Design an enzyme around this catalytic site. Structure first.
Site, PDB file in Angstrom:
ATOM      1  N   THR A 124       0.838  -1.244  -0.166  1.00 37.01           N
ATOM      2  CA  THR A 124      -0.101   0.016  -0.177  1.00 37.01           C
ATOM      3  C   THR A 124       0.841   1.264  -0.033  1.00 37.01           C
ATOM      4  OG1 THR A 124      -1.626   1.308   1.331  1.00 37.01           O
ATOM      5  CG2 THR A 124      -0.302  -0.230   2.613  1.00 37.01           C
ATOM      6  N   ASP A 125       0.339   2.132  -0.451  1.00 35.93           N
ATOM      7  CA  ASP A 125       0.883   3.522  -0.314  1.00 35.93           C
ATOM      8  C   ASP A 125       1.237   4.189   1.027  1.00 35.93           C
ATOM      9  OD1 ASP A 125      -1.915   4.452  -0.046  1.00 35.93           O
ATOM     10  OD2 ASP A 125      -1.953   5.949  -1.650  1.00 35.93           O
ATOM     11  N   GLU A 126       0.343   3.634   2.009  1.00 34.90           N
ATOM     12  CA  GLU A 126       0.543   4.251   3.350  1.00 34.90           C
ATOM     13  C   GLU A 126       1.763   4.073   3.782  1.00 34.90           C
ATOM     14  OE1 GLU A 126      -4.356   3.982   4.191  1.00 34.90           O
ATOM     15  OE2 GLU A 126      -2.840   3.277   5.786  1.00 34.90           O
ATOM     16  N   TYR A 160      -1.799  -0.478  11.457  1.00 34.90           N
ATOM     17  CA  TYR A 160      -2.086  -1.124  10.099  1.00 34.90           C
ATOM     18  C   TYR A 160      -0.857  -0.713   8.877  1.00 34.90           C
ATOM     19  CZ  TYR A 160      -3.384  -1.574   4.989  1.00 34.90           C
ATOM     20  OH  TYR A 160      -3.332  -1.949   3.694  1.00 34.90           O
ATOM     21  N   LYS A 164       2.294  -3.383   7.572  1.00 34.80           N
ATOM     22  CA  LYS A 164       2.444  -3.429   6.117  1.00 34.80           C
ATOM     23  C   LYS A 164       3.793  -3.042   5.571  1.00 34.80           C
ATOM     24  CE  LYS A 164       0.066  -4.711   3.126  1.00 34.80           C
ATOM     25  NZ  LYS A 164      -0.120  -5.850   2.683  1.00 34.80           N
TER      26      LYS A 164
HETATM   27  N1  LIG Z   1      -8.129  -2.001  -0.027  1.00 34.52           N
HETATM   28  C1  LIG Z   1      -7.034  -1.066  -0.489  1.00 34.52           C
HETATM   29  O1  LIG Z   1      -7.294   0.224  -1.028  1.00 34.52           O
HETATM   30  C2  LIG Z   1      -5.743  -1.480  -0.631  1.00 34.52           C
HETATM   31  C3  LIG Z   1      -4.545  -0.405  -1.151  1.00 34.52           C
HETATM   32  C4  LIG Z   1      -3.483  -1.350  -1.934  1.00 34.52           C
HETATM   33  C5  LIG Z   1      -3.511  -2.445  -1.251  1.00 34.52           C
HETATM   34  N2  LIG Z   1      -4.039  -2.868   0.092  1.00 34.52           N
HETATM   35  C6  LIG Z   1      -3.593  -4.153   0.330  1.00 34.52           C
HETATM   36  O2  LIG Z   1      -4.015  -5.299  -0.643  1.00 34.52           O
HETATM   37  C7  LIG Z   1      -4.522  -6.338   0.224  1.00 34.52           C
HETATM   38  C8  LIG Z   1      -5.977  -6.761   0.114  1.00 34.52           C
HETATM   39  O3  LIG Z   1      -6.591  -5.648   0.528  1.00 34.52           O
HETATM   40  P1  LIG Z   1      -8.426  -5.692   0.786  1.00 34.52           P
HETATM   41  O4  LIG Z   1      -8.889  -4.341   0.691  1.00 34.52           O
HETATM   42  O5  LIG Z   1      -8.606  -6.722  -0.427  1.00 34.52           O
HETATM   43  O6  LIG Z   1      -8.432  -6.475   2.147  1.00 34.52           O
HETATM   44  P2  LIG Z   1     -10.052  -7.003   2.831  1.00 34.52           P
HETATM   45  O7  LIG Z   1      -9.934  -6.646   4.386  1.00 34.52           O
HETATM   46  O8  LIG Z   1     -10.954  -6.926   1.742  1.00 34.52           O
HETATM   47  O9  LIG Z   1      -9.601  -8.585   2.609  1.00 34.52           O
HETATM   48  C9  LIG Z   1      -8.436  -9.105   3.544  1.00 34.52           C
HETATM   49  C10 LIG Z   1      -8.478 -10.691   3.198  1.00 34.52           C
HETATM   50  O10 LIG Z   1      -7.348 -11.308   3.753  1.00 34.52           O
HETATM   51  C11 LIG Z   1      -7.937 -12.504   4.536  1.00 34.52           C
HETATM   52  N3  LIG Z   1      -7.036 -12.825   5.816  1.00 34.52           N
HETATM   53  C12 LIG Z   1      -7.063 -11.978   6.684  1.00 34.52           C
HETATM   54  N4  LIG Z   1      -6.086 -12.517   7.630  1.00 34.52           N
HETATM   55  C13 LIG Z   1      -5.502 -13.461   7.024  1.00 34.52           C
HETATM   56  C14 LIG Z   1      -4.918 -14.652   7.308  1.00 34.52           C
HETATM   57  N5  LIG Z   1      -4.223 -14.421   8.591  1.00 34.52           N
HETATM   58  N6  LIG Z   1      -4.642 -15.679   6.652  1.00 34.52           N
HETATM   59  C15 LIG Z   1      -5.217 -15.805   5.391  1.00 34.52           C
HETATM   60  N7  LIG Z   1      -6.164 -14.628   5.263  1.00 34.52           N
HETATM   61  C16 LIG Z   1      -6.347 -13.612   5.714  1.00 34.52           C
HETATM   62  C17 LIG Z   1      -9.529 -12.097   4.846  1.00 34.52           C
HETATM   63  O11 LIG Z   1      -9.921 -13.125   5.150  1.00 34.52           O
HETATM   64  C18 LIG Z   1      -9.835 -11.423   3.536  1.00 34.52           C
HETATM   65  O12 LIG Z   1     -10.329 -12.156   2.700  1.00 34.52           O
HETATM   66  C19 LIG Z   1      -3.944  -6.129   1.833  1.00 34.52           C
HETATM   67  O13 LIG Z   1      -2.584  -6.568   1.778  1.00 34.52           O
HETATM   68  C20 LIG Z   1      -3.973  -4.637   1.713  1.00 34.52           C
HETATM   69  O14 LIG Z   1      -2.855  -4.371   2.728  1.00 34.52           O
HETATM   70  C21 LIG Z   1      -5.339  -2.536  -0.060  1.00 34.52           C
HETATM   71  C1  LIG Z   2     -14.635   4.632   6.880  1.00 33.99           C
HETATM   72  C2  LIG Z   2     -14.757   6.067   6.512  1.00 33.99           C
HETATM   73  C3  LIG Z   2     -13.517   6.846   6.334  1.00 33.99           C
HETATM   74  N1  LIG Z   2     -13.369   7.952   6.337  1.00 33.99           N
HETATM   75  C4  LIG Z   2     -12.058   8.810   5.709  1.00 33.99           C
HETATM   76  C5  LIG Z   2     -11.075   8.051   6.275  1.00 33.99           C
HETATM   77  C6  LIG Z   2      -9.978   8.277   5.024  1.00 33.99           C
HETATM   78  O1  LIG Z   2      -9.334   9.524   4.772  1.00 33.99           O
HETATM   79  C7  LIG Z   2     -10.708   8.200   3.964  1.00 33.99           C
HETATM   80  C8  LIG Z   2     -10.474   6.689   3.382  1.00 33.99           C
HETATM   81  O2  LIG Z   2     -10.772   5.782   4.636  1.00 33.99           O
HETATM   82  P1  LIG Z   2     -10.617   4.197   4.591  1.00 33.99           P
HETATM   83  O3  LIG Z   2     -11.607   3.480   3.702  1.00 33.99           O
HETATM   84  O4  LIG Z   2     -10.420   3.562   5.972  1.00 33.99           O
HETATM   85  O5  LIG Z   2      -9.346   4.026   3.844  1.00 33.99           O
HETATM   86  P2  LIG Z   2      -7.723   4.401   4.092  1.00 33.99           P
HETATM   87  O6  LIG Z   2      -7.649   4.427   5.682  1.00 33.99           O
HETATM   88  O7  LIG Z   2      -7.429   5.521   3.232  1.00 33.99           O
HETATM   89  O8  LIG Z   2      -7.081   3.068   3.815  1.00 33.99           O
HETATM   90  C9  LIG Z   2      -7.331   2.255   2.673  1.00 33.99           C
HETATM   91  O9  LIG Z   2      -6.523   2.550   1.567  1.00 33.99           O
HETATM   92  C10 LIG Z   2      -5.339   2.053   1.870  1.00 33.99           C
HETATM   93  C11 LIG Z   2      -5.247   0.894   2.117  1.00 33.99           C
HETATM   94  O10 LIG Z   2      -3.871   0.293   2.331  1.00 33.99           O
HETATM   95  C12 LIG Z   2      -6.193   0.315   3.099  1.00 33.99           C
HETATM   96  O11 LIG Z   2      -6.205  -1.135   3.371  1.00 33.99           O
HETATM   97  C13 LIG Z   2      -7.581   0.734   2.968  1.00 33.99           C
HETATM   98  O12 LIG Z   2      -8.457   0.540   3.828  1.00 33.99           O
HETATM   99  O13 LIG Z   2     -12.256   8.238   4.153  1.00 33.99           O
HETATM  100  C14 LIG Z   2     -14.625   8.873   6.092  1.00 33.99           C
HETATM  101  O14 LIG Z   2     -14.417  10.158   6.430  1.00 33.99           O
HETATM  102  N2  LIG Z   2     -15.608   8.402   6.850  1.00 33.99           N
HETATM  103  C15 LIG Z   2     -15.709   6.901   6.885  1.00 33.99           C
HETATM  104  O15 LIG Z   2     -16.832   6.456   7.330  1.00 33.99           O
END
Ligand SMILES: NC(=O)c1ccc[n+]([C@@H]2O[C@H](COP(=O)([O-])OP(=O)(O)OC[C@H]3O[C@@H](n4cnc5c(N)ncnc54)[C@H](O)[C@@H]3O)[C@@H](O)[C@H]2O)c1
Ligand SMILES: Cc1cn([C@H]2C[C@H](O)[C@@H](COP(=O)(O)OP(=O)(O)O[C@H]3OC[C@@H](O)[C@H](O)[C@H]3O)O2)c(=O)[nH]c1=O
Ligand SMILES: NC(=O)c1ccc[n+]([C@@H]2O[C@H](COP(=O)([O-])OP(=O)(O)OC[C@H]3O[C@@H](n4cnc5c(N)ncnc54)[C@H](O)[C@@H]3O)[C@@H](O)[C@H]2O)c1
Ligand SMILES: Cc1cn([C@H]2C[C@H](O)[C@@H](COP(=O)(O)OP(=O)(O)O[C@H]3OC[C@@H](O)[C@H](O)[C@H]3O)O2)c(=O)[nH]c1=O
Lengths: 346, 346
Positions: A124-126, A160, A164
């Protein structure tokens, strides 16, 4: 298509399930074994259509070395999505982040070393921390260091993002020390179908659908760089198949928007008044602005994002949540209740 | 400003030196050493000074119940406990993951619970590698040719990666939870009480035991040597006068390559300049480390006192010579361990 038998960890989650569908639809020579623990975030429904001879789901933990060993012995690559992914959960209870994000990654690395197989770490970018808003930058966002690059310092803010980041560091050290065939991607905020309703965009959309007010943290000035999960999938595919061993690639689609603007767009598209939402308690240590320069991926691997119209992508996402209410309706009450423990209207 | 401190890892090299420092210079402070007594922990490092000022508690920093009991009575934690050896980490990373990462997490959660001061002792290795001075346009003295507090993390090994990972969660716990933490990153320490697996003591005690010293490859690698007594005063200054959340680098401008150090040891011990073995080089071996300690100097007024390496080495040689009973029981076992993965180059 060099890899015929891949493991996709966390492939029952949002981004991972999108990638498994990508592989199923676009690379028919690839057999996928998903390893997923089915936490609160994992959902077999995100895979069900494609489960069969081409895609198997194995329910288990990436930190279960015996299970990982059994699967890795039969694989030619691992694409690692499994993570505890939510910043707000990590502030309430970091423990699963430590276990999954770091110990899990370690366990999978050791399997990749043992079997000498390809490993792609999805990150992730975070990991880079925060940036100032564009109005506060001498180059308005376009100068050197005003977006993240592959050379940017790690500086994570939360349990988090630090777990990561930590996982990224051990991946790289396993490359240098052991010759693990690893790459890393760091991607900006994904959106699209099948995202858990705890996350920002789907929370607001489904709150509206359920007759609950959307929730904006503070004044909503924070900036996220939005990419459609489909472009994330093709990015990861490019890196998996063509990436230079040991390198980090950043994935982004030049989609910076502040949270207020995204919420106002959601409200407008769903026929709601522009003031029909609540400001709520801001997040501890909240990261201000994230922004990715994806030049390296674009220039070296020839990748380009297809979903660069956020308004159109968001419309389709709204439609998806509206058309798939049975996919999320039973989780709504519990997710809003959990948020109520730490968030009040301000 | 602290009366009841916990020093983790205080039965090891650097930690015990710190404990001695507090015993000597701050006799109003009570120290509780929490140390697991691994292969590297040695009751003899503390035995003579145990009493009303210094107590030893044998246990693991990852034992949350024990950590809880101790932290409840403390006003600061100074954290040295780690698996410390790169070579060990290449043979078996498992205890590094446990101690360096899970142990730091466990201590941070206790610091957070009790709202007490936390000083994280870390290493220059988190920044990775630098070219040798002969390959740099500023010959080591230009921008970016030494590590600073602004340098990217880029660790090479399971050891340095787990240390870096631990630094990242410390910093995130500061931002997210307001833990009262500081970090130090120090260059290579030498002095009395260093375990004979490490470079300088290994060579000295090999010569004493009638065994050839061992040089990895041709000895080109550069380390920036600081006497542990100077590390101790650095840590003290950070603990008592440092700014919360900051990282300070500790170093004494002591870069030498390994061949030069070994040649100095041979000369001081009356051995021929060629009376050593070249041995198998380390996987992923880091080339040069070099610390710019300007921040610590400027901000806290710390100055190293032991900057004559020739004299410091002489005194160290004499210490190992005068305290053969302290190391003799470990010699055969440490050399046998190395023999499993290291041989004379020919
Ligand atoms: N959501 C985003 O914007 C974003 C940005 C880039 C990358 N990330 C990364 O992408 C990946 C997927 O994120 P997401 O948004 O799909 O997450 P999500 O929360 O939707 O999915 C997490 C998945 O991992 C599984 N899981 C959790 N702990 C586990 C374990 N110990 N063993 C096996 N499986 C496990 C969960 O059951 C679930 O299906 C993560 O590594 C996250 O850090 C997410
Ligand atoms: C859930 C929620 C979030 N927010 C804000 C917080 C953040 O600035 C923005 C996005 O929040 P999240 O959906 O929690 O995402 P973020 O913290 O940016 O992280 C996401 O992107 C990076 C990924 O690495 C991570 O897994 C993913 O959850 O919106 C709100 O203002 N209201 C809300 O209800
Ligand atoms: N040696 C150096 O040059 C140097 C440079 C800067 C900082 N570092 C850091 O300084 C610290 C101490 O290094 P050192 O050279 O004294 O190491 P060492 O190997 O001499 O001592 C490690 C000590 O930690 C203890 N320990 C290990 N695992 C433990 C656990 N799980 N719980 C409790 N105690 C445990 C051991 O018993 C031992 O006494 C480490 O954090 C290391 O990363 C060392
Ligand atoms: C044991 C040994 C080492 N070497 C080389 C390798 C290194 O370039 C140099 C120093 O080696 P170590 O003593 O293993 O130290 P290093 O890897 O530099 O790490 C030390 O400093 C940083 C600290 O973080 C770490 O805990 C500590 O062990 O000497 C040799 O040439 N011969 C040897 O017998």
């Amino acid at each position: 298509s060099q890899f015929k038998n891949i493991i996709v960890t966390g492939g029952a989650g949002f981004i991972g399930s999108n990638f498994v569908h990508y592989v199923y639809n676009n690379h028919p020579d690839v057999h996928v074994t998903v390893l997923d623990k089915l936490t609160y975030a994992g959902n077999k429904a995100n895979l069900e259509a494609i489960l069969g001879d081409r895609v198997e789901l194995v329910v288990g933990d990436i930190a279960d070395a015996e299970l990982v060993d059994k699967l890795a012995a039969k694989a030619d690559a691992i694409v690692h999505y499994a993570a505890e992914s939510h910043n707000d959960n990590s502030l309430n209870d970091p423990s699963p982040f430590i276990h999954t994000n770091f110990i899990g990654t370690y366990t999978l690395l050791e399997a990749a070393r043992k079997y000498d197989i390809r490993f792609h770490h999805v990150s992730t970018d975070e990991v880079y921390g925060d940036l100032p808003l564009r109005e506060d930058l001498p180059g308005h966002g376009e100068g050197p260091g005003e977006k993240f690059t592959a050379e940017t310092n790690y500086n994570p803010s939360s349990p988090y993002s630090s777990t990561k980041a930590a996982s990224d560091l051990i991946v790289k050290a396993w490359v240098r020390s052991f010759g693990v065939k690893a790459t890393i991607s760091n991607c900006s905020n994904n959106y699209g179908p099948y995202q858990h309703i705890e996350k920002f965009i789907p929370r607001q959309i489904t709150n509206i659908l359920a007759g609950i007010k959307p929730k904006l943290y503070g004044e909503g000035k924070n900036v996220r760089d939005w990419i459609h999960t489909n472009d994330h999938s093709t990015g990861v595919w490019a890196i998996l198949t063509k990436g230079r061993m040991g390198e980090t690639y950043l994935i982004g689609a030049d989609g910076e928007k502040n949270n207020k603007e995204v919420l106002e767009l959601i409200l407008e598209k769903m026929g709601q008044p522009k003031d029909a939402y609540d400001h709520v308690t801001d997040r501890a240590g909240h990261d201000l602005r994230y922004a990715i320069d994806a030049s390296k991926l674009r220039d070296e691997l020839g990748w380009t994002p297809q979903f660069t119209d956020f308004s159109e992508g968001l419309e389709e996402t709204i439609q998806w949540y509206t058309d798939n209410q049975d996919w999320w309706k039973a989780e709504k009450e519990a997710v809003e209740a959990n948020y109520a423990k730490t968030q009040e209207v301000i």
